[PDB]
Amino acid sequence: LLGEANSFLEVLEQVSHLAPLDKPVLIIGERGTGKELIASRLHYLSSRWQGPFISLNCAALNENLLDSELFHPGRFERADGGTLFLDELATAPMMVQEKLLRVIEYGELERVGGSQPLQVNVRLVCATNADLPAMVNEGTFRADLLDRLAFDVVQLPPLRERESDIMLMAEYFAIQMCREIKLPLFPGFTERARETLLNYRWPGNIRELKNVVERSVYRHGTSDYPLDDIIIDPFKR
């Protein structure tokens, strides 16, 4: 994990204290900010580290199949003894959100008839970029679920608020790309390059930075001169 920005370092410190708890954690941050990497850290730094790390994006699946996917068997079942990461929570159906509250509140998976309810031992982590308290007031997120799910909140800073890290990360990603394309040395970034990198708002944050930098190193294609042209938008040219 790259970064030295105070705001990022306070997140890592926080994660180190939260990881051993069995309490549910909410991660707030923009796309591409490393929320999944932090969730993975919460799992590997916990007592449950030898246990499974199951993950699921509540947008990587049809709305009507969330239920049965979550609770065919489900992610909870798979994460038993382990940890479950749920990205994109602010677009889960209310019923899944009320059922989610029940699994949190009661520690067991509801079973209709026949089978008795299934006891699970799962550390939960969720992630989003909504003002969840705003979705509660909007009738789009359950006030009761939030009152219990947000035991604590990890706020991951966007890249534009970790401005000291933009060049550190850009240089790392550029060097890795130089290795991929067999250039002998990364020749550096011009000041024009650095202005471009630092003045851009990075709506896709670290994912976007890596792709931008890699593309730019490739287009440049040489170690003879410093990299001047940062290609933010490949759809222009």
Ligand X SMILES: Nc1ncnc2c1ncn2[C@@H]1O[C@H](COP(=O)(O)OP(=O)(O)OP(=O)(O)O)[C@@H](O)[C@H]1O
Binding site as annotated, residues for ATP: 29-36, 79-88
Centroid of chain to Cα 141: 20
Centroid of chain to Cα 222: 34
Residue placing its CB nearer to ligand X in the complex, 4 or 105? 4
Strand order in the sheet with 53-57: 53-57, 83-87, 123-128, 25-28, 152-155
Judged by CB under 6 A, does residue 33 bind ligand X? yes
Looking at residue 234, its amino acid is P
Judged by CB under 6 A, does residue 37 bind ligand X? yes
Among 12, 36, 168, 187, binds ligand X (CB under 6 A): 36
Give kind and range of the element (H or E) at residue 84: strand 83-87
Could you give the string, one character per residue 176-215, with x where binding to ligand X holds by CB under 6 A and - elsewhere?
A: ------------------------------xx--x-----
Cα distances (angstroms) measured from residue 126 to each of 69, 109, 221: 16, 18, 41
Q: Which stretch binds ligand X (CB under 6 A): 29-37, 136-144, 175-183, 225-233?
A: 29-37
**Nearest residue (beta carbon) to ligand X:** 34
**Which residues contact ligand X by CB under 6 A?**
1-3, 29, 31-37, 87, 206-207, 210
